[PDB]
Every structure is written in C-alpha cells, then in structure tokens.
Design a protein around this ligand. Structure first.
Ligand SMILES: O[C@H]1[C@H](O)[C@@H](O)[C@H](O)[C@@H](O)[C@H]1O
Ligand SMILES: [Cl-]
Length: 303
C-alpha cells in the first residue's frame, strides 16, 4: 500500500506490464534540466528543480520535460526559454541510457520541445537536428522506443525512452504525437486534442499563467476527470508548475512548496484512482510534515 513509493528506483518494474503507459500514473518534472542553475537572481523563477537527472530518476520521476534550443547544426542545448542550462541533450540521454540499463522494466517518457530561437549559425530546423543527430543517432541505438503501436504497453517500452513530441510535425514515426501533424498545443489552457492520427485523445492542463487558486482548481479539475476515466486511449498530462509563483509566492520554489503538498493530499484522499501524468516543479523535494507529491503519484497506482 505504502510499498511502491518506498522503493522509487524500481516502481514501474512492479506493475503489470500489460498496462498501457497512458493508464499509469507517472510523476514528471517540469523544465527537468534547470537543476544546473546556481545564479540566485536568475534562479528565482527559472529554477524549477534541484535534483540532477539520475537523482530525479532514482526519486521515481519517469516523465521528463526537456526544452531545447538548436545551438549548432548537429547540437541541441538544454534551455529554460532564453536561459541556457549549461548542458546539451546528450547528457540527458546518457543518464536515461544508464538508468534504463540498470532497471530494464522501467520506461522513461521524454517530452521534447523547442524553447528558444536557434543560434544564428544554425541552418536546419530543430526537428531535423533532433531527428538526424539524436533519434537516428547510432550511438542511441537501442535507447528509443521505435515500435509502431500508438498506445504502447510497459512490456513494449521496457528499458526504452518513449518520445513525447512537442516539436510540431515530425518525420519520426514512434511515440506520442510522432507524426507530420505533431501535437496541437493550446497556450495557457486546459485542452483536448487527438494525436497519432486520431488514435489517442490527449487531455492537457497547462494553464501556466494562472493565479494560484485558479491553478489549484485547474489541477483538481483534471484530476477529477482522470479519476472516473478508465479509457486507455485517453492520455492525461496535468502540469502543477506555473509562471511567476502563481502571482502569489515570491519564487517558483516557494510556489512548489505550497501546491505540491496540497495536490499530494488531494490524491491521497482520493485513494488509488487514475491520476494521469502529473508534471511538477521541485520533484522529489520533501518538506517535513507535508505529503510528497511524487510519492503519492507513485502510490496512486493500484497493484
Ligand atoms: O513557459 C510555459 C510553461 O513551461 C508550460 O508548462 C509549457 O507547456 C508552455 O509551452 C511554456 O511556454
Ligand atoms: Cl546559473
């Protein structure tokens, strides 16, 4: 009952691998690579994580919100909008690769989004650079999920990174939104859109501008929908992250320390019901006396 989150390194290994990934309640980290920020002024808003990628994985995070900027024709740098996070995409991929080697029944969802205009030296699209120098890179040979099931199971994705495509139209053919239309993302909204040529109904709460109370209500609203929804063809992505501290708190850290426990308590109070994929700031950051969002997301999976 407590047991899954007691060992967050290997919690997916314990699930029925007949489950589709859409039916798994998965913790994600919003702007996953921002843990590298040390500048205290630049960190106030832009720093969303304090754990590195392997530590996030060891804490049970399995959805990663990677934002990129093309900084050479063969290279993607990891960004928070205009802010460079001091590493390239290769570093995230080397960690995931390593982690998935150690724990072969785990799977990682990696969201990929262009977060900033390319360096003036770049002449290719973000999507080509990603497809050509990362996805099709022989060095990442068996790392990505390359199957053609639009709605893959744990069994199918075990030990692999499944692409969650936020780049637009792609020639990549495997993963969520991997087609020439990509995912049609609505700005600062809760929205629904069919993806993978009509196979899946994507339901997203991404109201990233919300005042704090409205943001809490927006998360709770999509949790209440996921709760009664056993349709495996529906995918829920619920962002608990928000800009400018919800216009209520003085840093993204302060903001996270309020919404994360409030949502963790709500999930605990609802039992082991379907939550969808919840993407949080400060994943695996605990406050004494408060419920832990990543643990409660993990423990909401019924065995
Ligand atoms: O800054 C926001 C925020 O990071 C959201 O979670 C993301 O989905 C939006 O596209 C982005 O513009
Ligand atoms: Cl910095």
């Amino acid at each position: 009952s407590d047991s899954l989150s007691k060992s967050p390194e290997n919690w997916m290994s314990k699930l029925d691998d007949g489950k589709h990934l859409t039916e798994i309640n998965i913790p994600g980290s919003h702007d996953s690579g921002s843990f590298t920020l040390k500048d205290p002024v630049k960190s106030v808003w832009a720093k969303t994580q304090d754990k590195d990628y392997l530590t996030q994985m060891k804490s049970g995070v399995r959805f990663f919100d990677i934002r990129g900027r093309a900084s050479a024709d063969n290279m993607i740098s990891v960004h928070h909008g205009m802010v460079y996070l001091h590493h390239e995409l290769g570093k995230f991929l080397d960690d995931a690769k390593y982690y998935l080697s150690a724990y072969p029944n785990e799977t990682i969802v990696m969201s990929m989004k262009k977060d900033y205009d390319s360096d003036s030296k770049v002449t290719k699209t973000f999507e080509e650079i990603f497809r050509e120098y990362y996805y099709n890179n022989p060095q990442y040979q068996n790392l990505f999920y390359t199957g053609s099931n639009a709605n893959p199971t744990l069994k199918e994705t075990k030990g692999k990174i499944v692409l969650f495509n936020r780049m637009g139209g792609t020639y990549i053919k495997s993963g969520y939104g991997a087609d020439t239309s990509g995912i049609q993302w609505a700005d600062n909204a809760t929205f629904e859109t069919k993806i993978n040529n009509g196979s899946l109904n994507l339901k997203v709460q991404d109201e990233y501008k919300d005042y704090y109370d409205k943001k809490v209500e927006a998360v709770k609203n999509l949790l209440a929908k996921a709760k009664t929804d056993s349709n495996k063809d529906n995918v829920y992505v619920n962002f608990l992250s928000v800009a400018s501290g919800g216009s209520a708190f003085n840093s993204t850290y302060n903001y996270a320390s309020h919404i994360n426990p409030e949502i963790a308590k709500t999930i605990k109070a609802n039992g082991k019901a379907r939550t969808g994929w919840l993407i949080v700031d400060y994943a695996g950051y605990t406050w004494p006396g408060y419920d832990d969002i990543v643990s409660e997301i993990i423990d909401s999976n019924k065995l």
